[PDB]
Structures are given as C-alpha cells and as structure tokens.
C-alpha cells in the first residue's frame, strides 16, 4: 500500500505579476556559476 | 576553473571573549529572564484546540486560569474579552 | 622623490622591516622615559615634562646602537617619527617648535608617551559574525548561514 | 531597515510568541492603522488581534490615537522593540545602586509593563519570600522606601493618567479614553502605610488606584553614558581624574539637559565642597586638575567662564565623538592591523590626501598602500571626493582626494551590529531546535529523578535511571550549554557597543 | 476506529458513459479513484460512504467529457491512541512482534510493550515468554497466532512523495501494547 497523490495538475492562467529579482534569489535560481573565459577545451575534441 | 571553497581562510580571527563574576551574573540573569516571560497571561500562547476523542481524563488535567483584564479605563471601549 | 624617497627608501622598499623596527624601538624607548615620568608621578607639571621625552635626545638615542647610521639629522628621523605620529599612537602636544627641543622634534613625545586607549575590543569583534568575512554574505536563507557558517561553527566550536 | 525588522520579529518570537509577533511585525511594517484593516490584512480572528494589541499596549509597545472622523489609529514604536535587550543592564545597575529590593522592584515593573504602588510593593514582598527563610519576615516599609528612593533618583517614572470623565466630555464616552500625561507629579510617589508580611508559599481596595508607574529608560541611558565617560577618563589620565569626572558629572546630572552639548556652568568651589571627603585633596589640588583637564588637547572640558576662579564645562557631544572615533578605530585595527588604523587616522587628521602623500607620510611600501587603499575603499570606510581637472570630471582629468564620513560610518557599523544580534539568535535557536529532542529526553528523566524524592521513595532509582544513553551525552549537553553561554556573552557585549553607536548617532541628530 | 470524513472533488466523465444515470457513474468512478489507498492525514480510505451534493455539469471547450463537482463523505481507517484491538500475528522480529489486521499489517509490538520477564529467545526468532509460578519459559508466540488482544500506544504517518527531478515501507504506522494483564493471547485469560 502507498500514500495517495493527486494525479492531475490541470490549471488555467489568471494573472501575470511583473517585477525584478533580488541577487540572493537570483543566485538561488541559477544552477551554477560560469567562471572560465574560454569556450572549448584545448584538445581536438572541441568539448566545452 | 574551480570557484573557491565557500569558506575562505582569514588571517585575522575574532578577538577572545571576556569572563568574570559580573559577566557570569549577567548570563545567569539572562537565563532567568528567558525562563520567566513564559509564565503569565501576557505570554499569549495559542488557545487549546482540536480535541481528539471524548476521553474521561479531561476532568482532571484541564488548565484553569483567570481571564486577564487590565485597567480598562486606560484602553478604548472596543476590545472587551468578555 | 625617486632614489631619495626619504633615505629610508633603501633596498627600494622604504626598508619596511627597518622602518617598522625603528618605529617600534623609538616607541618603546620613549615609553621607557615617559614611564620614568609616570613611575615618579613627578609633581604633575614635571611628570608631563619628563613625559616630554626629548626628541633631540631621542635622535641622539637613535643614532647609536647602530640603528640610524643612515641619514638621521632631523629630516629623516623627524619624518619617521611623524609616520608614527600618524595613527593613534600619538595626540597633539607639540606646542610648536619653540616649546621643547624643536617642538620635541615633530612632537615625538606628544602622546606616544601615553598611547593608553580607553576601550577593550568591541563585543562585535569578539563574536564570529564580527570578524566573519562573509558577515553580510552569510545570507542565512542561502548557502552561507549562521546555522552552518564555518566561522560561527569554529568560533563556537572553541 | 530590514535587519531591524528581523530583529523586532525575533524578539517578539522570543518574548511573546507567534500571534503577537505577527501583529507586531505587521504594524511596524504598516504604521498607524485602524483595527478593522489590520484584522482584514492579517486575516486572523479579531479576538487574537484584540488580545495581542492590549498586551502590547500594556507594555507600551504599541499606542492608539483618536483620528479624524472618529476612527482610532493604532501605531507601534520600533525603537521600544529594542529595549528588552538592555533589561539585564537596567537590572544590574539598579542592583548596583540599590539593594535586591530595588532589583525586584525594577524586575516587576519591567515584566508587568506597568504597576501601581500597592501592587508592585505587594508583589515584590510576596516574591521575596523565596529569598528569606528561618522565620524572616518582609514588610512593605522597606520596599516603599526603596521605590521612593528610585523614583526620587529619576529611575522610576509615572505613567500617563486617564482624563476625568465628569470634568471633560460628559455624556457618552469617546471611543478611546485619550490619556493625559502630567509632569508635575512625575516622581510624586503615592502615599501609603499598609504593610503585609510575605506568605512563604504555604499555599494556604487600592488606595493608589490608577497611579501607574514605569521604568525610566532615559535615566538608565544617562547613567550608562556617565559610566562610559568615567571609564573613558579612567583609561585616559588617572583614577583621580576619573573620580573628578565622576564628581562633576554628579552635580551636572541634577541640573543639565540630556540633549544639550554642554552642561550647566559649574564652579570649582561647588565641586570641592561636594567632592567626597574620602580622598586626600585640597581646593588648590582640585583647581590644578581642572585647569590641566581644560588644557587637554582632546578638549574634553572647557573653561567657559571665570566665576569663582575655577569655572569649567564638560563637552558631552565632543566626548561622544571621541568615543565614536575610538570604537571605529577599534574595529579597523582588528580587521586590518595597526597599519590600517595608521593610514586612516592619518586621513582623519589630513582631511584631503592622495596615495603618494599617504605613502610618504607612513612609508607604507609601494605595492602595499595602494592595494590596501583600494580594499577599505571597497568597505565604504573611506569616501572618495574626486575633484576635477576639467568640468567633464573625466578619470584622466581628476584628482582622487580621500574624505571621511563619521556619521555614515556609525550608521552602517550599527547595521552590522544589528545583523550581528540577529544571526546569533538564529544560531542559538538553531542549536536549541536541533537539540530539543535530546533536551526533552533528558528533562523527562531528570523530572522522574527529582519527583517523589521528598515522599521517601527507595534509593534504587538514581543509578538505575542513569544507565540510559543520555549519560554519555551530558558532556554534549554541556557543550551546547557553554556554546549558548558563549553566544550570550557576546550578545551582552555587542549591546555595550550599541550604546556608544546609538548615543552618538542620536546626539549628532538635531531632531528638527 | 472507523471514521467518516467529509470530502469534495471534481471528476471527468468520458462521453460513452452518458447512457447511465449520472450519480451511479460518478459514484463508481469516485470509488475506483479513492478505494484501497491511504491519506497522509486521516488514514486508510476503504470506500465512499455517500454522495451529498452535485453541481452543474460543464462541458469545457477542447473536450467532450462533462465535468462536475461532488460533495461526498467516505469511511476511513484511523484508530485512535489507547484503542483496544484484536489482530493476528504476522511475524516475530528482534524489535518486536509484527501483527496483521488482515487488510492492514503495519502493526509492531516492541519488546518494551512485551512482558518484562521474557526479553530474548534461544537464538530462535520465535518470541518466547516467561512468568513466575507457571509457564516455565516454555510458551512462545506463533508467527500467525490468534487474534491477540492489544491496545495501540503510538501511530505515525510518513510521507513518500517523489524527490528531485523525475527520471518501500508503508506510509502509515502504528504501535501496540501488550504488557497489562488480560492482553495478548486469549488462552492466557
Ligand atoms: S557567516 Fe556566520 S559567523 Fe559570519 S557573519 Fe554570517 S552568521 Fe555571523
């Protein structure tokens, strides 16, 4: 036996709130930080 | 390539704290106060709610307290606790 | 200002180690003289007079022990003494060049004789947050948080 | 003021709980508002809102005002939300200046918000029953003596009185009673002769009705300022000078205004006659100290006259400025070393200066002064003036003159401290909530051990209960305890800085 | 033990079901949707109890299936603390004896709940028993056993919602007590 979860999430848009983002929250959203200038690895694999 | 540790090394470190009978007395007084303001009607905790079942024991350990009422002359005539 | 840089410039560094050790030596010796003054508490006018560690006599102390064999006469010593008069080691007591030995030379007694402060380290610097570099960067909600702040942790761990 | 808002929040949580915290934070975030909109925005039951608001107004955390169209507006004072931190300080100073009876008087007055003479003296006498035993009894005479001494010494102040109904606005009463404060009876204690022996917890009409009293925080702060000044002078010059400063502050207090930069005129003759006789000092000796103090390069006191030969006036604002300076240089020196404190105080004296002069004037080596000058520029501890060489103010056509700003400094150091107290409370609470499981597990067994002890139960429980896992965890409990202790001590200390910061930002503020 | 709880929900009915009267269709759908599963807050749903109220049946654009909302009540398994109960054994364990209620099985009788004299077995997982005068450490509880009498003393819900981006224990738990006289195997009483 297993605990029940709702199976549907169907919903409709009602409003759009505009605004800006705080830097701590902006970092929280971001997955990672980019830190290297260059684009691809020096080797002939063209890997990022 | 690698962003640093979240916790960089710092040479300057926090100055050592004080101690003494006076400081210990103030710490004891602080402990006393944080233990004190829990024990009077001004500490308005949430009223008891959502009883589970009609247990017989409730006749005994029911918490009884007076309906606190300040000097009502000193407040507007709009918030009577009844 | 180039090769000159003040003759302390030697090694093209202002000879940082020698200038700082010379400043420390000057400070400690004039503390010793002002300490004779304070120990004696000489009838306080003369207590403060002996606390005027004569900086002509400091200058003659610093030529010897092989310290200031480099250019010493007023200008260079007086200006290193002045580099010590910059900061809280000292407070205004020159009374111009006329009162005292050329004003005890830039006032190299002034209140070096008594740098004695008036307050211990702020409770803030005692706490971790105070010194904690990521002080404002300790966004509790985010990665750095007091509930994990390695500094707080350490500070409290010891 | 988000840091402050958080401090309010966590103080309300610590001292009052959840609903009180909610209402408090909402009010300080919204300002004066009538009851209905507050209840609407909060969405909680109006009974809880009412109860909260009356408990806050009982402790004077909030106020109510009659407003246009007859509505009643309710406002909260944010500053008062930062005073419970100093309750230990108030209790300590009253214990230092008065016996434990005065300590209990101040404790009751603070924790009750307001009290009347009969109520406070009776409650103090009743609570003191835990302090005296072996047949010792407590009578309200000594309690009343200590309270009247407190009130006379300005440490206890009377609350505003309600207006007389039969004398003003006869007929239907207004929505709010509109209390009125009276100053001539500020320290006029009510008269009573009732005495009651305290009941020693055996478990077996007000003549001063409406005459409420409350602690004088201003008097406490003034006393703290005097203590700080006396301490400052003690470290500065000598204990004898410090005692002189303790003295002329004493006659200053009884007549000087709290906000005036300069005290009332004080002569040396009155200082000498009021000077304690326990110190071997003559009038000429006193005059010498006062003359040489007035000659102090820090201009701590000024002559300001010649009446009676010896005539002097202390400069409170200038002393506070020196205090503010010293504390700021304190932070700098531990954060950056003596050299940083050297470079700044150079700049403090040399109002305008650039890198080359700084280096020349301190032999801060090349490739060392510039980088450090960039660092504490980044800390906002230094302001760049940047005069032009051309009206375009181009970077190639400007000079980088450095300039100090003490007031802005004192402010965002104070903000640093505010964030300081907060994240401590965060950790203290984090530690408390993480350890609460072991705490309750140890408290229940401790209560079991402590229980049925006087009943005469057998001794086969002390060792048999200790075999539990908490016994090899008591050292960890003590580890938590000292950690909280060590946190609390720093909080206490931080409050000691806060006093200096708040005092100077207040004095420099003209309030116009 | 059995509790009846009020419930509201919205349901979709595909068009081929229009032939049947609407209440019975919505009833059987609601039953299959609810029946034989547990709620994190009120316990194990058994079956609908009754359908109280019905709204108007809409037909949203982009679909042909009538939508509607129901007010209804349902019967849920949710014993209260200190409740007496009788149930079969299902297996012994070092941490206690597992008890089965036929349709539910997450009941444990820990050794703290078991009688003090018997604290461990002769290395055989079958829990043994010990008393003072009779029952000379020879009686033992069979993994199936009878419907032993016991009183619940603890209960807990544990959530098992998915964690992290997409691509075993029961979520509802109880503890029983058997120490008091009269509890356990009826053969003893
Ligand atoms: S990181 Fe931790 S110790 Fe540092 S300021 Fe933030 S809360 Fe305080």
mmCIF file of C-alpha atoms in Angstrom, chain B:
data_model
loop_
_atom_site.group_PDB
_atom_site.id
_atom_site.type_symbol
_atom_site.label_atom_id
_atom_site.label_comp_id
_atom_site.label_asym_id
_atom_site.label_seq_id
_atom_site.Cartn_x
_atom_site.Cartn_y
_atom_site.Cartn_z
ATOM 1 C CA UNK B 1 38.357 26.710 -13.286
ATOM 2 C CA UNK B 2 37.213 25.918 -9.689
ATOM 3 C CA UNK B 3 35.441 28.611 -7.567
ATOM 4 C CA UNK B 4 36.884 28.694 -4.208
ATOM 5 C CA UNK B 5 35.752 26.995 -1.041
ATOM 6 C CA UNK B 6 32.568 28.560 0.257
ATOM 7 C CA UNK B 7 34.698 29.387 3.325
ATOM 8 C CA UNK B 8 37.965 31.193 2.559
ATOM 9 C CA UNK B 9 40.809 31.274 5.049
ATOM 10 C CA UNK B 10 41.178 34.503 7.042
ATOM 11 C CA UNK B 11 44.269 35.541 8.997
ATOM 12 C CA UNK B 12 42.502 37.845 11.458
ATOM 13 C CA UNK B 13 40.351 35.886 13.868
ATOM 14 C CA UNK B 14 37.676 37.034 16.345
ATOM 15 C CA UNK B 15 39.055 38.722 19.457
ATOM 16 C CA UNK B 16 38.806 36.462 22.546
ATOM 17 C CA UNK B 17 35.732 36.863 24.735
ATOM 18 C CA UNK B 18 35.574 38.158 28.309
ATOM 19 C CA UNK B 19 34.807 36.285 31.506
ATOM 20 C CA UNK B 20 34.256 37.286 35.116
ATOM 21 C CA UNK B 21 31.844 37.025 38.034
ATOM 22 C CA UNK B 22 29.894 40.020 36.731
ATOM 23 C CA UNK B 23 29.608 38.579 33.229
ATOM 24 C CA UNK B 24 28.535 35.244 34.704
ATOM 25 C CA UNK B 25 25.899 37.035 36.799
ATOM 26 C CA UNK B 26 24.573 38.779 33.692
ATOM 27 C CA UNK B 27 24.444 35.454 31.860
ATOM 28 C CA UNK B 28 22.534 33.927 34.780
ATOM 29 C CA UNK B 29 20.155 36.905 34.778
ATOM 30 C CA UNK B 30 19.645 36.470 31.030
ATOM 31 C CA UNK B 31 18.839 32.787 31.561
ATOM 32 C CA UNK B 32 16.417 33.740 34.339
ATOM 33 C CA UNK B 33 14.606 36.228 32.130
ATOM 34 C CA UNK B 34 14.314 33.867 29.163
ATOM 35 C CA UNK B 35 12.833 31.378 31.623
ATOM 36 C CA UNK B 36 10.459 33.989 33.111
ATOM 37 C CA UNK B 37 8.309 35.615 30.432
ATOM 38 C CA UNK B 38 6.651 32.237 29.697
ATOM 39 C CA UNK B 39 4.652 32.200 32.961
ATOM 40 C CA UNK B 40 1.925 34.882 32.854
ATOM 41 C CA UNK B 41 -1.144 35.746 30.739
ATOM 42 C CA UNK B 42 0.877 38.274 28.733
ATOM 43 C CA UNK B 43 2.556 35.205 27.178
ATOM 44 C CA UNK B 44 -0.408 34.598 24.885
ATOM 45 C CA UNK B 45 0.131 31.101 23.535
ATOM 46 C CA UNK B 46 -2.346 29.685 21.044
ATOM 47 C CA UNK B 47 -5.617 28.558 22.692
ATOM 48 C CA UNK B 48 -6.094 24.820 23.060
ATOM 49 C CA UNK B 49 -7.961 23.322 20.108
ATOM 50 C CA UNK B 50 -8.807 20.129 18.196
ATOM 51 C CA UNK B 51 -9.571 17.562 20.860
ATOM 52 C CA UNK B 52 -9.170 14.021 19.532
ATOM 53 C CA UNK B 53 -11.850 11.961 21.326
ATOM 54 C CA UNK B 54 -14.106 12.198 24.369
ATOM 55 C CA UNK B 55 -11.593 10.856 26.875
ATOM 56 C CA UNK B 56 -12.744 10.682 30.501
ATOM 57 C CA UNK B 57 -9.447 12.012 31.883
ATOM 58 C CA UNK B 58 -10.167 15.577 30.708
ATOM 59 C CA UNK B 59 -11.999 16.145 34.026
ATOM 60 C CA UNK B 60 -8.674 16.487 35.886
ATOM 61 C CA UNK B 61 -5.736 17.944 33.927
ATOM 62 C CA UNK B 62 -7.769 20.804 32.400
ATOM 63 C CA UNK B 63 -5.747 24.020 32.624
ATOM 64 C CA UNK B 64 -7.618 26.699 34.593
ATOM 65 C CA UNK B 65 -6.642 30.380 34.511
ATOM 66 C CA UNK B 66 -8.263 33.748 35.180
ATOM 67 C CA UNK B 67 -9.440 35.886 32.260
ATOM 68 C CA UNK B 68 -6.753 38.568 32.417
ATOM 69 C CA UNK B 69 -8.157 42.103 32.387
ATOM 70 C CA UNK B 70 -6.022 45.282 32.633
ATOM 71 C CA UNK B 71 -7.225 48.622 33.990
ATOM 72 C CA UNK B 72 -9.877 49.090 31.321
ATOM 73 C CA UNK B 73 -10.133 52.836 31.992
ATOM 74 C CA UNK B 74 -6.746 53.033 30.226
ATOM 75 C CA UNK B 75 -7.880 51.436 26.932
ATOM 76 C CA UNK B 76 -10.592 52.090 24.329
ATOM 77 C CA UNK B 77 -14.022 50.583 24.939
ATOM 78 C CA UNK B 78 -13.747 48.313 21.911
ATOM 79 C CA UNK B 79 -11.866 45.111 22.887
ATOM 80 C CA UNK B 80 -13.727 43.565 25.829
ATOM 81 C CA UNK B 81 -12.582 39.926 26.267
ATOM 82 C CA UNK B 82 -15.916 39.061 27.924
#
